[PDB]
Symmetry: D5
Subunit: 148 residues, 10 copies
């Protein structure tokens, strides 16, 4: 259980996204005792994740890649076109690069830049991060077992 993971994090809503990252890193720390290295990569926004993952993926250096971003409807434009582009983008890359790309590119039904909202997700992303943590291990692990 010793391999590298490239955590790609969009910078939109950094405080929320960061919570997922921190939580991801911490959980793995607690499960693998650092035997799993998590390299963090910043990226402008979600849209920038697919390509970045593609690149970081083909380097062969990572057992899995994580895409973390908060794509929300800010009330002026439509966030879904990107969300789709990105959730699909990652799926495409991993299908190509055959390197697992876990998604922590969440899009909430509602997020109006309010305390309640902002606090809810600031907190939830932690949960999500832990989920991503386990998923990452589980997948990498099973692929290994699968591998011939």
């Amino acid at each position: 259980t010793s391999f590298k993971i490239a955590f790609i994090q969009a910078r939109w809503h950094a405080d929320i996204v960061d919570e997922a990252r921190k939580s991801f890193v911490a959980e793995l720390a607690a499960k693998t005792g650092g035997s799993v290295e998590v390299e963090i990569f910043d990226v402008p926004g979600a849209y920038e994740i697919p390509l970045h993952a593609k690149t970081l993926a083909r380097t062969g250096r990572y057992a899995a890649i994580v895409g973390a971003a908060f794509v929300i409807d800010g009330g002026i434009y439509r966030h879904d076109f990107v969300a789709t582009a990105v959730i699909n983008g990652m799926m495409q890359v991993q299908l190509e690069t055959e390197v697992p790309v876990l998604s922590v590119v969440l899009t909430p039904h509602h997020f109006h830049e309010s305390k309640e909202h902002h606090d809810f997700f600031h907190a939830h992303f932690k949960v999500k991060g832990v989920e991503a943590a386990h998923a990452a291990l589980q997948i990498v692990s099973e692929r290994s077992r699968i591998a011939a």
Copy 2:
């Protein structure tokens, strides 16, 4: 007609998903006296099914692959994105690998984590499993036919 099917089950809502698997397997068993071997492959969540299926498909070890997951709207984030990515994912994969990927990656209009909803799908997935069984059989059968 003695072959192997890869049953890739996501682990979210496992209790529900398992019902589709158990059913799927039991049907094939009954309908094929055991001729069909169904190898189970766990996976974090639906988003992990495509690649897994590609990886598993390309081994050529299986006559057909089944993607099983319950992708639901949990009232917090949007689920349709991943749902799409996966349903498309499996389609893409099977088109590349030329290996039948059956979809038991279901998305209900409503699943609110209540006795009713859970009881409903825990029960329904059994039906879907049986459906996937007959589908797998039928498709694997038809392909080999048009092959000759």
Copy 3:
């Protein structure tokens, strides 16, 4: 040339309604081509199983066109659009990569609650779509044969 083959891939969900499109489709060609055009029928579990089948059949080079027939309806339990999309996109993709025409008769109603009226309505309508399909098939296979490939 007027003589060629068409692989008619039909999903078996709502087989009753899908069948009508087939029966109709075949009848139209027979009535137009006069048997000149052969329509081979392939059964498939559900619409999702159409893309790959169409691809495999397309690659055989035995057909001037493939036809995907299916009724992808919302059953009030799961969302049907996800598959419908994959299928409508799948056929589009298969035909795009295999350069073999794939006509869609994979219909998705706004409403279909399996009630006498609904069943009856579409059972009848699919006949119409089938005819349209036949004409489209002839039209497209033809138009392509007259293309200045330069």
Copy 4:
């Protein structure tokens, strides 16, 4: 002086034609016949992508135009095809690298009523002219860029 393949779906031809006629008219006007437009009949919008690809691959055309009226007729969902097509053309031009212009419009509402049929029979003439320019423009640009 170049060739343009204009693929026109036949569903709602009365309306599709309208966009194609204005296209031909405009190019004829703006390029005085210099730019040739080859019209290609096609059953429905779904048949456009592949046709587009095939023609683009002949290398004969500077650009291709997909013209279709994909509307919601009240019985089935049109969006699935519309998507497969708007995406299909987009996919073909990205593949063949032959600009594919879209005149595959999908109205919010079109109920086969006089008001509607009349509105779009009219509006497609406008769209067709827009296609014309967009065509000329893009083709032009690709050269300015190729040099």
Copy 5:
């Protein structure tokens, strides 16, 4: 120092423009002219993908930016195109592995009114800044994870 191809749709040009002007401005106030931005005009958002692919292929650009205003004019559905363009770009940058930043905006509403116009006319300035930073940040990041 590097170059950025800025492909801009011409629909709602005056609004799209603000995005560009701002982008070019911000970069100057950040690269002091180091980063050169070349503007390319294209008919509509649908015309961006292929252009960005073409320009990407050249290798002359560290990143490509697509700017367009794809709104619901109230007659046809714009989401089909919006989707195609957004995917298109993402697809192109994935093939060419050349960053393609999106400034292909689609507002929930835009009814050609003083209020609406004046709002995005100004907001595209903001977005253009964001597009500037993103480009710098992404182009920077890529080269880094490369060395």
Copy 6:
């Protein structure tokens, strides 16, 4: 059980609406040997039914009133508003007048003025008419019962 019913039919889509009337009347005729007299009242459109029903109801001349209309979305303006106003209207009216107002004021999810749609509803309204007939009978019957 020999009484009068006021059948208020809007004239939009008359060809469709008439089918409900003709059917309504024929059913009562058959089921009541003519005992039930159904007086027909034309009206511009659905929006005109409520008042008309009030006016007609208050005469006390009728045991029950029927509002018949096809209120559809013609793709230009919104129909739901009037649809609502009328369906509520009839309800309001009957609650005031204490006179049963049956609703055959139908609104289809889709009616695009095509052979199919028209043929469909021209035929269906006949069924609805029959339904309204049995409803009228039943309701008038039940009321008089609880009256005794």
Copy 7:
């Protein structure tokens, strides 16, 4: 007082499913009130015919509460919400003007395509709603009897 009457007005559309709510409703009261509470049943064509009936019955003063039971479902042909609304509003209005409680068991599913699962599901569920109704009826009739009317 524990002894009083309830007029249970039930629409006859989907009578099979509506009936379950009634059977259940009555059984619950009998199991709680022990016959102390009488439930008179009145049949009505459809939900739309509930408001006025409830009003007429309310005005009789014979009931401590009225209960409207109906399944107002989207049948994939016409919009059901218009009526559903009129009915849910109607009962609310009747009870408001007649000062007589009117409990709603006029349920409208997100989805009901008259398929085995759907029918079965609601056929069973209405039993639950019926129980809830009985409890609500008792609860409300009671709470009102303990109100300081000053």
Copy 8:
């Protein structure tokens, strides 16, 4: 066929609304030769129509009242709350005042302040006006026949 009609017209989108008025007046002119007087009343917006109709109605001076307004979604706020309030408002008034109130308070699915749009409705309202014209007569007439 000699009576008075109070045409109440909101002033939002006056040019479009006006088309309905002009057309209304003209049609009646052509059918009743002025034997039907149409009194025009201006009103700020649609919301102001109900009360105005109520007042003008109770004066007993009019056989019918027409509400004309164009309530549209201007893209910033929601027009429906008003639309509903108004379409219901008129229905309520006429049910009260028992004076027919015809509705020419149209709400289009789309109207983005564009030439195509603006021209379409500038033209359609004429049609609608003619419809209102006939409806008005028909209703007033039938109510008369109905009257005892």
Copy 9:
């Protein structure tokens, strides 16, 4: 120093209670016990309007508060009742002319999950305080106006 009738639906009591407790707490705090709040249990939100009317008509209360959590449970449509209630209360206060405050909230989403139950158990405390103020305020205003 006046009386307030607080009608609380019992569906999702755990959450409804939360809004009622904070209401009582606030008034007790702000009015030091001066303002009395009488709690009235009610089966569901639908039972509130009538109760509201009845109580308002006793003339005993300065204001009435309807508290309920009307949510979409995934099986039936909640909006019909929600409407009948938000309108019903509004109708009653317009009738009885006794201000009726609404704490009959309808969440966009509430799936009986921990995250949700926890969020609203929390948020209802906030709403309850808002009710408290709104109550005090409106009652106060009506007097300032009655004089």
Copy 10:
């Protein structure tokens, strides 16, 4: 000369305010103070209807105006209230036959952002003007059709 009761909800007060200030301003610049506007504060939009009924009853007002900003905060559904308030007002002015102008706005979107806030903060000024004119026009019209 006459008086206009201006009931204003306090939610999003700063925005609602602009509406009022503008209204009062416009009237001054049109009645030179002839028309006196009395402001009444109320907790939320739901609290307007009854107040407008009460104030209407007084007879002291030629017209009543309800101003509120009822937006979708992203947690609960606001349309229930919006509807109740809008209907409420319309209902009240119908009973009391006292004009009740609505400045109870509900934006498609408003996510508590600089852009959103600043936009309605300014637009409510515009709306307030409209509300001014409408009041003058309606109060004028009524008295006319009365004489």
